[PDB]
Each structure stands twice: as C-alpha cells, then as structure tokens.
Amino acid sequence: SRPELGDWSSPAELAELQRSQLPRVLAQALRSPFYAARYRGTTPPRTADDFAGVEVTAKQDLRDQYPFGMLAVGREHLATYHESSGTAGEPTASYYTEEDWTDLAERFARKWTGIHPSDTFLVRTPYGLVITGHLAQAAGRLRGATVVPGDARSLATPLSRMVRVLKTLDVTLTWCNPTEITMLAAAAKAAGLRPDQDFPHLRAMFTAAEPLTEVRRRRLSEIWGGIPVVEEYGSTETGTIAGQCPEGRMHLWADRAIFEVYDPRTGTLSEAGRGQMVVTPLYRDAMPLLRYNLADDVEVSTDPCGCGWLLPTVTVLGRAGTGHRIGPATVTQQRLEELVFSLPAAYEVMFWRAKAHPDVLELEFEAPEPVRQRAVKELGAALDRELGVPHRITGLAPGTLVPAEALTAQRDILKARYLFAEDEDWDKAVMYF
Amino acid sequence: MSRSRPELGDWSSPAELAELQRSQLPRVLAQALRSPFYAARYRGTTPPRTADDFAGVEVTAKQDLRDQYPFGMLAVGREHLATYHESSGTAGEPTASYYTEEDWTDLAERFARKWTGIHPSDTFLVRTPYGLVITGHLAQAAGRLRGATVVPGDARSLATPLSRMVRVLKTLDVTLTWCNPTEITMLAAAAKAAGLRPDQDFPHLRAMFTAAEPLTEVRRRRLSEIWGGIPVVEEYGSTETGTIAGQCPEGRMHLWADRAIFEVYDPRTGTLSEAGRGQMVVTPLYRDAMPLLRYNLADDVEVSTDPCGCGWLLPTVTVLGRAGTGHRIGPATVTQQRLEELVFSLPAAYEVMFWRAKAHPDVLELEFEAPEPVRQRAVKELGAALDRELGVPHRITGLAPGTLVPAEALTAQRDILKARYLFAEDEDWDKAVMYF
Ligand SMILES: Nc1ncnc2c1ncn2[C@@H]1O[C@H](COP(=O)(O)O)[C@@H](O)[C@H]1O
Ligand SMILES: Nc1ncnc2c1ncn2[C@@H]1O[C@H](COP(=O)(O)O)[C@@H](O)[C@H]1O
Ligand SMILES: Nc1c(O)cccc1C(=O)O
Ligand SMILES: Nc1c(O)cccc1C(=O)O
Ligand SMILES: Nc1c(O)cccc1C(=O)O
Ligand SMILES: Nc1c(O)cccc1C(=O)O
Ligand SMILES: [Mg+2]
Ligand SMILES: [Mg+2]
Ligand SMILES: [Mg+2]
Ligand SMILES: [Zn+2]
Ligand SMILES: [Zn+2]
C-alpha cells in the first residue's frame, strides 16, 4: 500500500510514485476547513500538474487554525493529538489516524543500522504533547524492539536513572537529541561508567531535533566508543522527512512526501538547491498539508551518493545557519561548533556557549583543570585562523554550565501524602513531584 | 466467539468464576517455572503443575522482585518483550516489570473496563507519567484499543504545566481525563486561576478516571462536585500487575478475578483467604513475560464477596494502603483516611482542597489553604469535627492561597526549547545547554 526503499530504479520512477498520489492528496486537503476556505469561489487543484500552482502553507497558518482548522476527517477517526515545541503562547496542533501512524512509524524505522526484536531501545525524548517519544516508541513496537520509555524533561527520569538503565538493561539503541548524548556521557562518568568502554551492548545512537555538524556527530560517536550516531530530520507536523545513510548524509524520504526548496525573496520553489524546506506528505488523512514551509534553512542535492538509495540528500543549517556579524566576520553556530569539536577528544570539551556582540565573540566552555589553558589557546588560534573574529574565550570548571546535581541527583517517584509522622518531610504533601 | 480471554458476563456464579481461573493454572505454572526465579525456587524438589498444587504455592514478596532486578522474573526470550517499566517509590531499589504484545492486550482490556465507556467520540487527556512507569502507556493503550483520541498530557514533564493542560481541557473539548485524585484538584485550582469554573466551563468533560492514592468516598464525591457532578471513576493497580480492580456505577471497585486469582494475606497468622482484611496477593492468569505466583503487593485491603447493587458477580475491594496506618496521638488513633473524610466534609463553598497533617505524640498539626473570608469558619468547623470524631488535641492553621500550592504551578507557561549554543547579544544564553 505504501512504497519501500528499492521500489524505484530511477528519479523518473520516484517522480511517478509521487505524482500518482497527488489527486487523492489534493482531494483530501480540500476536506479541511483551511484549504476549503483557501479555494472557496474558485476551482481547486485536483490533478498532479495543478500541484505546480499550489500556494505554500506557512507555520503561521497552522497557528491561526488552532486547534482543528486543518482537520480533514471526523474526530472519531483520530488516534492521537500533539502540539509542537517552541512558543507555548501560540500552539501548533497536529493529529493522526491509525493509518497516518503506520506511515510515521515506517519512516522513523528507516535506520540503516536496523531496529530488530534483539534490540533494547531507550526512548529519551519527551512524551508530553510532542510526538517525538510516541514516534520512537511506535517504530520500536513496529519492529519488535523492547521499548524502555525514558521520556525527557520528566522529574521521574533524571540522567542518573537513565545511565543505570543504559548499563543494567544492556540497552542496544538510544533516541535523544545530540546535547542529551553528551549529557548522558557526563552522567555516565559521574556514575563511575566510561562511555567509550562500559556499555558493550550499545550498538547505535539515533538523534535529531538540533542542527548537527559532521565534526560534532563524529565526536559524539568517539565519546561512546566509535559506535554509529544515526541522524534523522523531522517535525511534529511532518514526522521523519530524512534519515542518514551508512556514509553519513541524510536522504529525503521522497517516496512518502514531495520535497521542494523555497526562496523566500523570489517566492520560487525548486526541487534542489539552498532555501527553506517545503513538504507535501503523501500518506496522511487527518491533517493534510500542501507545500508546508517548515522554514528550516536547508541545502538539497540530488547528487548520486555512495549508498545508492536513489534519493536526494539534505543538510539542515536551521537557526545554526543565521550569520551574526562580529567586526569584519560573519559567524554561524554551525561553524563555531566545528571549531569547538575539533579540539582533541582528551580535552573533554562538550559543553559550551557563545554570545555575538557587534565587536567580539564571547565564548565559555567546560574543561578539566590540567588541559583548560591548552583548550583556551587552541580554540583561540582556530578562531583566528578560520574566522578572524575578535573573541573573549573563558574555560570553566566542569559543574559550571552543567551542574553536578543534574548528572547525579536521584529522585524518588512519590505520590501525594497528607498525614505525616513527626520526623517526615511534609513539604512533599501536595507538591510531591 | 473468537476472543481468547474472558469478559464480564461469561460466568453466572462464583463456582463458574472459580473454574474459569482453575483451567488456566497448568499453563500459568508451566510458564512460571521458565523464569530463573521460580526454576531456582523449585530446584531439587517437585514443582507445582496442577490446580490442586496451587494451594501449596509460596508467596512472592516485593523484596523478591527487587532481588531479581532486572530480568530474574523473565520467562520468555527478550526478543518477545514489547515494553519495560519500573515502579514508583524508591529510585534506590528499582522494581522491573515487562510485557509481550499479548500481555499488553490483557493490560489494555482491564484498564478499558470503565463503566462510563471509552468510545471513538471521546478525547482522552492522559495526565499521568510516561517516564518508566506504566500508567501513561496503559491509559494510552486502552484509548487506542477503544478508538478514543489520546492527548498525551504526561505528568511531571516540564513540557506540560497545569496552565497548558487547562487550555487543552477547554479548547480541545476533552471528554475523559486520567490522573491521580490530587491532580484532579490541581487542575481545578489551575482552571480557577485561568478564570474558568470547573463546575460549568468544561461542558464536554463527561468522566474523570483516577487511581494511585487511597481515596475516600467523601473526597471522591467532592472531586465530582468540583467538576460539575460528573463521574469520578476509580481503579486500583500496580506496575507489576496492571489494573486489578475497577469502579462499578454504584461506586465500589470490583476485582478483575477473571484475569487473576486474588487472595488476602494476614501477616499475623500468615494465612491466605479469598476475602477479608489484610495484604493484597495476586496471581495474574494471562501473561507470558513476567509470571507471578501469589505476588504480595503488601497493600492493606478489605475484600468483600457481599453482593453490590451493580450485580457484576465479582468481589469488591477497598484499598486503605498507607492511609490506613494509625498514628497514636495519646489515646486516639488518627488515619489519613479519617482526617480526609473530615477535611472534605467542609462545605464546598469554603474551597478547602490542599492540606497536610503531622502526628506528634501529643498533638495533630494540620494546615490547609482557604480564601480569607472563609478561613476562620473552616479552622473552627474542622476543629469541631476532630473533637467530635477523634477527640485528638490539634493545632489547625488556615493558610493563604499560594502557600502550599504556589501560583506559578497553576499559571506559569513554559516554552519547549531545544539546545542553542550561539546567542545574539540581547538573548538569555542561560538556556544554551540547560534548556529544560
Ligand atoms: N536533524 C535535524 N537537524 C536540524 N534541525 C532539526 C533536525 N531535526 C529536527 N530539527 C528541527 O526541529 C524542528 C521540529 O520542531 P517540532 O515539530 O516543534 O518538534 C524542525 O523543523 C527543525 O527546525
Ligand atoms: N485506587 C487506589 N487506591 C489506593 N492505592 C492505590 C490505588 N491505585 C494504586 N494504588 C497504590 O499504588 C501502588 C502502585 O504502585 P506502583 O506500581 O509503584 O505504581 C499500589 O500498590 C497501591 O499502593
Ligand atoms: N525531539 C524533541 C522535541 O520535539 C522536543 C523536545 C526535545 C526533543 C528531543 O529530541 O529531545
Ligand atoms: N527530529 C524530529 C523527528 O525526526 C521526528 C519527529 C519530531 C522531531 C523533532 O525535531 O521534534
Ligand atoms: N499512576 C501514577 C504512578 O504509577 C506513579 C506516579 C504518579 C501516578 C499518577 O497517577 O499521577
Ligand atoms: N494505579 C495503577 C493502575 O490503576 C493501573 C496500573 C498501574 C498503576 C500504578 O499505580 O502503578
Ligand atoms: Mg477518536
Ligand atoms: Mg524485544
Ligand atoms: Mg508497585
Ligand atoms: Zn548515502
Ligand atoms: Zn458494584
């Protein structure tokens, strides 16, 4: 019913797998109050050729239509409801039928390392309204992997507990953002476990949600013993839209969506190049999207890649591509990250932050005491040689940017209690979290 | 014809129920021996295989589940597990439980035994944790079994503060909630703080499912009244057992005895019986991954086989738990359950929801929040109730709202941020790496 990797042998065959779905997709879209309103008074697009004419759908549209302005089915058919991360003030609602969920789960499950019944899969992203935890769990169950629901941002599951679970359950796969990969490495050391040796069953780490350079991705692999760090690109509104190949580039899942690159200035859409990621999902019923602009800054290739899936590649600059002018130079987060994570691994520089002033780059990072002044000097020389920005670099003690208590605090999972003995803490009566 | 597990109405007498149970025990006892824990227990001797042998079977204690952490109780290949969970309470001494896909169908069916129904027309806010504990996953699996739209509210997540849950309750026309009874009061207080009346401004809310705390009928009825007189539907369960009892329309919880053998353990005499007062013992009948033979939850319960007005033909259960622990204060014994009945007997217009007490050898110290006009009435009436019902000496203090339950818990909104490393000059770079 839905295409599989290897169902097309050329870009022309891929294009027809897409084109054949557009009548159903355009018919389903018009069922939603948003698109019915958009094409009121005129004749709607109904054929594949008409799709070239279709107007972009912006984030602002999804926000204006809160909660169910984008809904194309009866609510009786919805399986789950979700809201996006970012501004709580302007919620972005997304919702999925059971059949919508099978497409979502299949796309996440396209992990070049596999997800198997022999896997124990720690899901360490949030389950609170956002889709990310539910998505990894649904893929885990689709493939028969034992799912350990770690959740994230939950008082029930601090880092100390996740490290104990990683070790004691022989976890084989993780799902968490790239910062959480470093947070778990720092929490592992604090629990007396070496990330590079003491987790012999950990075979791959799945990651997304942040702009991630190859330089940082490779260091995260090295920190955890040289195991694969497998990136994907997605959103609450779209699910997974690209996944890594064994060579380390992300390929667009174009059999399940039409991908286009939007120039915001000219307002023109092309199938490759530099611009804003536009997505038309092909296998949705509940929340149809026509050329939804994620507004992520991306470069799409279509270059023949060494893996040979016959899919375009994508690099996600995102916000990390926003140039800040500092004296004569433009610095991006992506370029700073490459310099920070080019420091030797033995310096253990993982946690850092920078502020762009009009005149100077202020940058702080944690490094153990013996190596700190080497690290400050080498990062300074790297910035001089690569950017020529003025900089004030400060090395900090570990425990300064990422406090020791975040790495080691354990928290009992209490329920409300009302009657206490004299020697008990009655501060946990009603505020027990 | 073609469901493999029993449903309400498949037995017409206690004798028929008993045979539905006994017929599963050879499979259950064979599966139990496959686990390292039971194979070790019955090493060197003859293991139990038949129904008659079950009378002989030794209790499995919580301390056994802790000693066996993580997979000493595992009876199948790890390839067959769907999910892994750990219990609430002490993080220092974890209890693991785990379930195959088929184990999950039994769990989901038991939660779904809600006398109010769960239908495709329902929008179901799941407001218990998804972090290792089973509760969020269990409500979500039942929601999907019955076709209800599941809103994963999670609980104890920085992503879902009460202000956001109130907005969701209202704007999505939520029909069903699942959360502990304290969370029901927290949501009511957050609604008021947002300028919404729980008793009128949520017209689509038709029932509230609850568990996890000892809950008196007096408190349960007040929680119903606060939210407009809608049903508050209780169940009783544990991470290791799933749902073991659920409420009937008359307001008592019935044991799901078609899916487990329930026994009451007297710790003093060390005897197991099918009814009475003591510690809840459970033998689940429809699980493969983590077989349990007479697992003692150690919850303090009263099981009655007395007929209820509902007519389901299952024994009822009351869960005293910790709230049944007598603290002696001179000649009087005070229980949480009895204090709760007095606090929630105060008139609803006084708005007393949040309280706490400490047992001193000489005096009961009790504090609660009440609006200013009514506070002195509340202090006096609760004092007279304690004098009349317990005769304990008491120091009762009424507190300003925002004192036990801060305003920021009820109204604070929190952006769901991702890590950022490079900031413009005017931004807060404190959310770089600690972005929670
Ligand atoms: N691999 C990735 N690299 C960079 N940014 C990503 C990646 N995956 C997700 N994102 C970002 O996360 C957003 C998803 O937002 P949300 O739907 O709120 O979870 C995307 O639109 C991107 O801005
Ligand atoms: N309806 C209920 N009434 C009283 N206590 C309950 C109820 N439901 C659950 N519990 C308690 O919560 C425990 C479950 O603990 P856990 O497995 O850690 O979630 C039970 O063993 C009881 O102590
Ligand atoms: N994927 C995520 C999201 O959507 C929101 C917050 C956190 C994450 C993550 O990967 O941890
Ligand atoms: N990165 C994501 C993904 O791959 C799937 C779904 C959501 C996200 C996200 O960034 O939140
Ligand atoms: N059900 C719960 C649990 O098992 C642990 C902690 C909290 C709850 C709850 O109902 O909120
Ligand atoms: N309270 C619970 C329930 O009702 C079902 C399953 C588990 C629990 C729990 O408290 O762990
Ligand atoms: Mg529905
Ligand atoms: Mg498995
Ligand atoms: Mg328990
Ligand atoms: Zn490739
Ligand atoms: Zn009854």
Side-chain angles (χ1 to χ4, degrees):
Chain A
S1 199
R2 283 180 301 285
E4 299 299 335
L5 290 175
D7 281 3
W8 60 95
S9 56
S10 81
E13 226 191 332
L14 178 46
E16 254 304 329
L17 278 197
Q18 297 178 304
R19 190 165 286 278
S20 62
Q21 306 308 304
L22 275 172
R24 178 179 48 79
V25 167
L26 294 162
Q28 189 69 15
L30 295 174
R31 281 170 171 81
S32 95
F34 177 68
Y35 290 117
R38 172 172 279 193
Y39 295 115
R40 174 173 217 163
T42 69
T43 305
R46 72 169 39 85
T47 80
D49 304 3
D50 291 345
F51 175 77
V54 169
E55 188 198 350
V56 285
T57 306
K59 274 199 140 67
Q60 191 47 55
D61 294 311
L62 270 51
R63 293 196 272 259
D64 293 356
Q65 293 298 316
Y66 181 80
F68 291 115
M70 309 297 289
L71 179 59
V73 298
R75 288 180 50 167
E76 55 271 21
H77 301 298
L78 296 183
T80 71
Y81 167 97
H82 300 277
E83 299 187 353
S84 290
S85 80
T87 313
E90 291 191 72
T92 298
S94 71
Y95 31 79
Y96 297 105
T97 64
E98 286 296 345
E99 193 60 28
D100 294 358
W101 260 105
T102 309
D103 173 48
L104 286 173
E106 284 165 353
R107 280 190 272 123
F108 184 97
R110 293 174 171 185
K111 295 281 171 281
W112 70 253
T113 61
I115 310 168
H116 302 117
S118 62
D119 284 313
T120 301
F121 187 23
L122 178 64
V123 172
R124 216 304 203 268
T125 67
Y127 288 77
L129 285 176
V130 297
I131 204 176
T132 172
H134 303 277
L135 176 58
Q137 177 153 332
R141 280 183 85 175
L142 177 67
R143 292 291 172 249
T146 307
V147 169
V148 184
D151 199 356
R153 308 187 188 218
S154 173
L155 293 172
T157 55
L159 284 170
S160 55
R161 195 160 183 163
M162 297 296 90
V163 158
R164 188 210 52 219
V165 159
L166 267 183
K167 176 55 169 185
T168 64
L169 304 191
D170 305 321
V171 168
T172 63
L173 301 169
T174 60
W175 166 244
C176 69
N177 73 52
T179 303
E180 191 76 8
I181 294 179
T182 46
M183 292 294 286
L184 285 160
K189 276 167 279 196
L193 294 171
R194 297 161 296 190
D196 71 5
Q197 293 166 67
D198 286 331
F199 303 83
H201 296 278
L202 185 61
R203 80 181 181 84
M205 305 186 86
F206 310 159
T207 204
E210 294 180 39
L212 181 61
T213 61
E214 148 60 27
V215 170
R216 182 172 169 213
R217 194 182 57 71
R218 184 165 268 286
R219 177 56 54 73
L220 298 191
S221 173
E222 277 184 355
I223 282 164
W224 283 99
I227 63 174
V229 176
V230 184
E231 199 184 356
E232 71 160 60
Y233 170 40
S235 78
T236 311
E237 311 91 64
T238 64
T240 313
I241 57 189
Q244 190 187 91
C245 75
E247 281 290 355
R249 277 206 284 248
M250 288 191 296
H251 286 253
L252 288 165
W253 301 140
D255 63 307
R256 312 295 266 250
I258 299 163
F259 292 108
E260 288 161 309
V261 170
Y262 177 78
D263 178 32
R265 284 290 297 166
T266 60
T268 59
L269 288 158
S270 37
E271 295 160 289
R274 176 70 178 293
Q276 289 188 350
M277 182 61 86
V278 169
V279 181
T280 305
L282 300 181
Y283 303 94
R284 301 190 147 212
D285 281 25
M287 195 195 182
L289 293 181
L290 302 181
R291 296 220 273 184
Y292 171 63
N293 189 354
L294 267 70
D296 295 322
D297 190 30
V298 304
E299 198 178 348
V300 173
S301 72
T302 72
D303 279 334
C305 208
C307 171
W309 280 331
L310 273 52
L311 286 168
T313 67
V314 62
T315 314
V316 190
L317 300 321
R319 175 152 286 199
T322 313
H324 304 245
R325 282 185 162 79
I326 301 185
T330 317
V331 311
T332 67
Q333 180 173 292
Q334 166 177 295
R335 191 45 182 164
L336 284 190
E337 173 177 298
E338 287 180 331
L339 304 180
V340 169
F341 283 99
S342 293
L343 292 176
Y347 295 175
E348 272 182 276
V349 177
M350 300 174 283
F351 305 127
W352 67 283
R353 58 172 185 182
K355 195 179 285 142
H357 308 278
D359 60 312
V360 69
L361 179 66
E362 193 188 355
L363 192 155
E364 291 176 347
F365 67 84
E366 286 184 1
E369 169 42 30
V371 308
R372 187 169 306 142
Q373 297 315 127
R374 304 261 305 164
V376 172
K377 173 146 188 161
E378 289 178 35
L379 191 57
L383 263 54
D384 299 342
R385 284 177 317 89
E386 298 308 305
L387 290 179
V389 281
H391 54 75
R392 198 214 310 151
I393 300 169
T394 314
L396 303 170
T400 305
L401 292 178
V402 177
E405 57 258 37
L407 301 177
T408 61
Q410 312 210 1
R411 204 176 182 81
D412 292 349
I413 305 174
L414 300 178
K415 307 186 208 223
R417 285 192 53 209
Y418 289 96
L419 178 53
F420 295 82
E422 173 176 288
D423 61 341
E424 291 193 283
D425 183 16
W426 74 339
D427 285 353
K428 313 305 212 136
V430 54
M431 303 306 293
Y432 52 90
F433 290 178
Chain B
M1 50 174 62
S2 87
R3 34 69 157 189
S4 313
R5 281 179 302 284
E7 252 308 321
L8 291 168
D10 285 352
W11 60 95
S12 56
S13 82
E16 289 195 351
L17 179 45
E19 258 309 331
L20 277 202
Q21 296 178 308
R22 271 149 72 165
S23 62
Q24 307 306 304
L25 274 173
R27 174 180 49 77
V28 168
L29 294 164
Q31 188 69 9
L33 260 297
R34 280 183 184 99
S35 93
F37 177 69
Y38 290 118
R41 173 168 281 190
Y42 296 113
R43 173 157 54 239
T45 69
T46 312
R49 288 188 184 83
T50 79
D52 305 2
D53 292 344
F54 179 76
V57 170
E58 194 189 353
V59 164
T60 307
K62 281 206 186 171
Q63 187 51 54
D64 294 310
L65 267 53
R66 294 198 213 97
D67 292 356
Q68 294 298 315
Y69 181 79
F71 292 115
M73 311 296 290
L74 178 59
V76 297
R78 285 189 52 173
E79 303 78 34
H80 301 297
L81 297 180
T83 72
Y84 171 96
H85 301 275
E86 294 185 1
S87 288
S88 78
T90 314
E93 299 166 73
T95 291
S97 73
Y98 32 78
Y99 299 104
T100 65
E101 286 299 342
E102 193 59 27
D103 294 358
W104 259 104
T105 309
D106 172 48
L107 290 177
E109 285 165 353
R110 281 191 273 133
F111 184 95
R113 289 170 172 192
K114 293 281 173 280
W115 71 253
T116 61
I118 307 160
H119 303 115
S121 62
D122 284 309
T123 302
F124 186 25
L125 178 65
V126 172
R127 174 46 167 199
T128 66
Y130 287 78
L132 286 175
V133 296
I134 200 169
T135 174
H137 302 280
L138 177 57
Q140 179 155 324
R144 281 182 85 174
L145 176 64
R146 293 289 173 247
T149 305
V150 174
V151 183
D154 197 357
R156 308 178 186 233
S157 172
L158 293 173
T160 59
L162 288 162
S163 56
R164 192 161 187 166
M165 296 297 91
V166 166
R167 190 255 301 149
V168 160
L169 268 186
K170 175 55 159 184
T171 63
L172 305 192
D173 305 321
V174 170
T175 63
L176 298 171
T177 62
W178 163 246
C179 67
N180 74 52
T182 303
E183 191 73 4
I184 294 179
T185 47
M186 290 296 207
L187 283 163
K192 288 162 181 193
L196 297 172
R197 298 160 295 192
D199 66 326
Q200 294 208 321
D201 285 330
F202 303 83
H204 292 279
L205 185 59
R206 81 183 180 77
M208 306 187 87
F209 310 160
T210 203
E213 295 177 42
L215 181 60
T216 61
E217 176 186 327
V218 168
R219 180 172 170 211
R220 192 181 59 71
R221 281 192 266 107
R222 176 56 54 73
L223 298 190
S224 175
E225 188 181 350
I226 283 166
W227 285 98
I230 64 176
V232 176
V233 184
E234 201 184 355
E235 71 159 59
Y236 168 40
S238 79
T239 310
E240 313 90 68
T241 63
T243 313
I244 57 193
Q247 191 188 90
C248 74
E250 279 288 56
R252 277 173 264 247
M253 289 190 296
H254 285 254
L255 289 166
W256 300 139
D258 64 306
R259 311 295 265 250
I261 299 165
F262 291 108
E263 291 167 305
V264 173
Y265 178 75
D266 178 32
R268 308 265 144 158
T269 60
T271 186
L272 288 167
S273 37
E274 61 183 349
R277 172 151 185 69
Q279 289 178 8
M280 182 64 83
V281 171
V282 180
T283 304
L285 299 180
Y286 300 94
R287 62 159 66 184
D288 195 39
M290 193 196 184
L292 294 180
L293 303 180
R294 300 175 128 167
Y295 173 61
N296 186 359
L297 271 65
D299 293 324
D300 191 32
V301 304
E302 307 217 59
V303 173
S304 194
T305 71
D306 275 350
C308 207
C310 89
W312 274 348
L313 299 180
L314 286 169
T316 68
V317 62
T318 308
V319 194
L320 301 321
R322 183 157 207 112
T325 311
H327 303 243
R328 321 326 178 281
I329 301 178
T333 314
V334 314
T335 66
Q336 181 171 293
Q337 273 217 320
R338 194 43 180 166
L339 289 186
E340 174 176 298
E341 287 180 330
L342 306 181
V343 169
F344 284 99
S345 295
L346 293 175
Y350 293 7
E351 304 189 285
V352 175
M353 287 179 278
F354 305 124
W355 67 284
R356 58 181 185 173
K358 201 136 53 153
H360 310 280
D362 61 312
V363 69
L364 178 66
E365 193 189 0
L366 193 157
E367 289 175 354
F368 64 86
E369 282 183 8
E372 185 286 327
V374 171
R375 181 175 308 144
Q376 293 182 33
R377 277 186 259 183
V379 170
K380 173 182 69 197
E381 291 176 32
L382 192 58
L386 264 59
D387 300 341
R388 186 197 146 122
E389 301 308 307
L390 291 181
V392 283
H394 55 76
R395 201 217 309 149
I396 299 166
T397 311
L399 301 174
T403 303
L404 291 182
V405 176
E408 85 175 20
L410 302 180
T411 62
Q413 311 179 347
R414 205 183 177 83
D415 290 1
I416 309 175
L417 298 177
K418 313 219 147 144
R420 286 191 55 205
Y421 288 94
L422 178 51
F423 294 81
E425 177 203 327
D426 50 6
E427 292 190 282
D428 181 19
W429 73 339
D430 271 37
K431 291 163 223 132
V433 169
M434 304 306 297
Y435 53 91
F436 286 8

